[PDB]
Amino acid sequence: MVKLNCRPLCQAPTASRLVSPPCFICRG
Amino acid sequence: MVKLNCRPLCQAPTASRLVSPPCFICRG
Amino acid sequence: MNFNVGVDFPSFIAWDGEESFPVKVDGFNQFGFTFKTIAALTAATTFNIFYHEPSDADPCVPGPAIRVPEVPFCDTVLLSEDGLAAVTLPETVTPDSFCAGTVPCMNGQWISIAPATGSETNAANVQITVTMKGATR
Amino acid sequence: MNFNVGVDFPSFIAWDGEESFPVKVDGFNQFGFTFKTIAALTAATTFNIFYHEPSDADPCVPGPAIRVPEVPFCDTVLLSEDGLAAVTLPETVTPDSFCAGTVPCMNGQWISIAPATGSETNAANVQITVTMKGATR
Amino acid sequence: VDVNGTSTPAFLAQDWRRFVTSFPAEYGEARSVMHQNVFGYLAAMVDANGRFLFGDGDLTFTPDLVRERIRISNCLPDPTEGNTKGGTGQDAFAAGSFVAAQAA
Amino acid sequence: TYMKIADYGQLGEYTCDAKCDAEFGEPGNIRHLEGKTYDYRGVFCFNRKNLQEANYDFLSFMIGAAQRSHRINRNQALMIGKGVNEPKGWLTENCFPVFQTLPVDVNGTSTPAFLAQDWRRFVTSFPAEYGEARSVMHQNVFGYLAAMVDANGRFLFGDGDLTFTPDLVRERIRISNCLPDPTEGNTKGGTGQDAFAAGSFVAAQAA
């Protein structure tokens, strides 16, 4: 049974799109 | 004299809204 | 890991909707009840516990249907007008909740439950069975 | 002096001879079946075992009826096709003589029994109940 | 209080501090009793900007309830009907509810 | 097996003086209980000729690979494990009382959010007669509380030191990286297309 070991070549173009909580005041 | 003893089988899932004070609004 | 819990504590049907059943408690030495409904109720619901004797024709066949007198414990405040045992399923019992009960003084050879008169409509919605405790043989 | 045995191993009906009934076995860790015939049978009757899953809509109602996978053990040498829990009450089983069994590996949330194809007519004269065992709930 | 033309009853921290200091000092010192859900309501009060009114930036507000002269009891009428289930803008704070007592 | 005292009754109800009797109250419950333990097993295969004439030790790596896999799977099961042949976890059985936060408006719409009101209201809403109680939450969730701003722009916690760092253990917090961390990776706490995916587990608190 052929075992396919696999690997990328494009190191890490992640671009996680980090977000922080914006200005949230109340719920009224 | 029979002593009836009763338990529930399944507990219903609960959900409570954690309401909080609204933002300060002037009176006037 | 579950043991074969049918070789002791064996249960039998007692009231399957619209039919009573004599369940032999001769060998076994202890027994109770387990009430479970299948739907919502309308009003209160009572039941009449009975007992029977081995017929003379065959000592292993049900005979007549005789009631069981309710023996009172201490701290009793009310006794049925005739002094005969009776179980009452209280109103507002949701059909996902089992109720347990038993008679405190066995007499006869087997037990049978039947709905008290005038309360046979809700009797359909109830489902009653009987388990055992001992063997003695 | 008969202890109240409703609590501490209650019981419920699984096959009243007319229709199946799912019996919750979640809050309990052990369980077993206690068969009982009501009349004289004709041919060997087999029963299929099914386990259920909590409905995505409401976790207190049954979902579909999945089939319990049969599991062998040390000296099992006659496994059926692909494995499915199917008990077979043999012939020459008179009334007032109960047989009992169970499934070794529990799975799902509750179990339901139904007569296998070819044994439904005979199954109309048998009763099946279950007696759970103890657990924390 | 009036929100979007709809008059709704509420309980502002200004009212509490106005209620406590309104005691007839001649009577002496007086403690205050209230349910735990009330003190949880005041501590989580916010101004128009976003900062808390009590304990500015410490994630929790717990002073000693002896110098503050407040004693909690978990079976008082609990103005929040249900455990922390009342106090938002609309559909909240049924009127005529007991909040807190204070006496010598 | 063990017992669990369900509830007491009530006996001493006030009554009149001029009467030589009493009233029998109702008794309580005992509710004897039980419980089991589950097993954890498995197998693998090696090759005599391959493992022998190999570059280095492969066996001891597998033992280390087995002890850790058991270690992480047990904890993962101990939290969310489904009842069947697995310890019932406290996440999925839905026996704990669970709260939920109501959403906030933005540009006329309404998106689910997690304000600083909640975490201060949540931890201070716990019966003070149960004793102290630690809380548990994922690291990314704590990074959401730290970088919170008011309307003007100042920080809400630790105004002006670039880092909050509040000495967690002092205030009943214990960070763990097994929790579902509602912020997907470290980006789900937004306002527009990054809605908070209402229904995720933020944090738990218990004795």
Automatic annotation (TrEMBL), chains C, D:
Protein name per Swiss-Prot or TrEMBL: Virion-associated protein
Organism: Agrobacterium phage Milano
Automatic annotation (TrEMBL), chain F:
Protein name: Major capsid protein
Species annotation: Agrobacterium phage Milano
Superkingdom, taxonomy of origin: Viruses
